[PDB]
Write a protein that binds this ligand. Structure first.
Ligand SMILES: COc1cc2c(cc1OCCCN1CCCC1)N=C(N)C21CCC1
Ligand SMILES: COc1cc2c(cc1OCCCN1CCCC1)N=C(N)C21CCC1
Ligand code: NA
Length: 190
């Protein structure tokens, strides 16, 4: 009877566009906004937030049949994360391991300077394969910044408490900010 770890499928439609079909795993029901679910969609690496009870773009929501059931040292670390591009050449992004992901146990939350939204990867596998180099509260408040983009602070990172997750009203990504840095300098809170 778990929410965390439920598998779901649904349709998605924007405006008069076509309906696309999606499958994913529910990770979290956000405590400061229980309408908001964080979801990992199969094949896509970002964590997404949807208010499933209110978002008219969601249709035909179904619960899928239920699945049949260390390196905490990496949490908080600066990392260089290597990956393959479409032409087969190697590239790398620098980022920060944020936490273990809640439901998909072997998975970690991570974000990157080049794309400071919330991602999820099986970083211990990536580490064993040589693709991860390891280097050396406002929750519940409203946020705005000037483009007025509005949102809510939904989580504080235990390992780096100046780092927060923000859900903006106009988008389904989860944004990550370290409030001492330039990238956060236009965020204001209420
Ligand atoms: C609408 O979602 C996506 C749209 C796109 C996508 C991935 C999407 O979703 C990933 C998984 C979360 N969504 C699934 C339902 C809501 C969030 N990669 C793309 N190139 C596009 C950009 C426009 C076509
Ligand atoms: C597509 O990127 C990655 C894919 C993968 C990855 C690391 C990747 O990238 C890290 C940094 C962010 N990327 C996000 C867009 C490009 C960079 N570790 C893996 N096991 C996989 C292989 C299939 C899942
Ligand atoms: Na207010």
């Amino acid at each position: 009877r778990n929410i965390v770890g439920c598998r779901i499928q649904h349709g998605w439609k924007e405006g008069n566009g076509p309906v696309t079909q999606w499958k994913g795993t529910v990770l979290d029901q956000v405590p400061v906004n229980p309408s908001l679910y964080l979801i990992k969609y199969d094949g896509f690496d970002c964590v997404y937030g949807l208010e499933l009870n209110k978002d008219e773009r969601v249709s035909a929501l179904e619960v899928l049949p239920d699945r049949v059931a260390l390196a905490d040292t990496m949490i908080g670390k600066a990392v260089e994360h290597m990956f393959e591009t479409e032409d087969g050449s190697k590239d790398e992004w620098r980022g920060m391991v944020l936490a273990r992901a809640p439901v998909m146990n072997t998975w970690f939350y991570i974000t990157y300077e080049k794309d400071p939204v919330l991602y999820m990867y099986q970083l211990l596998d990536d580490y064993k394969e040589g693709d991860l180099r390891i280097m050396p509260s406002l929750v519940g408040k409203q946020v705005e910044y000037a483009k007025k983009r509005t949102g809510m602070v939904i989580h504080q990172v235990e390992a780096k408490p100046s780092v927060y997750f923000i859900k903006f009203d106009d988008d389904f990504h989860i944004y990550v900010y370290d409030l001492v840095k330039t990238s956060a300098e236009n965020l204001y809170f209420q």
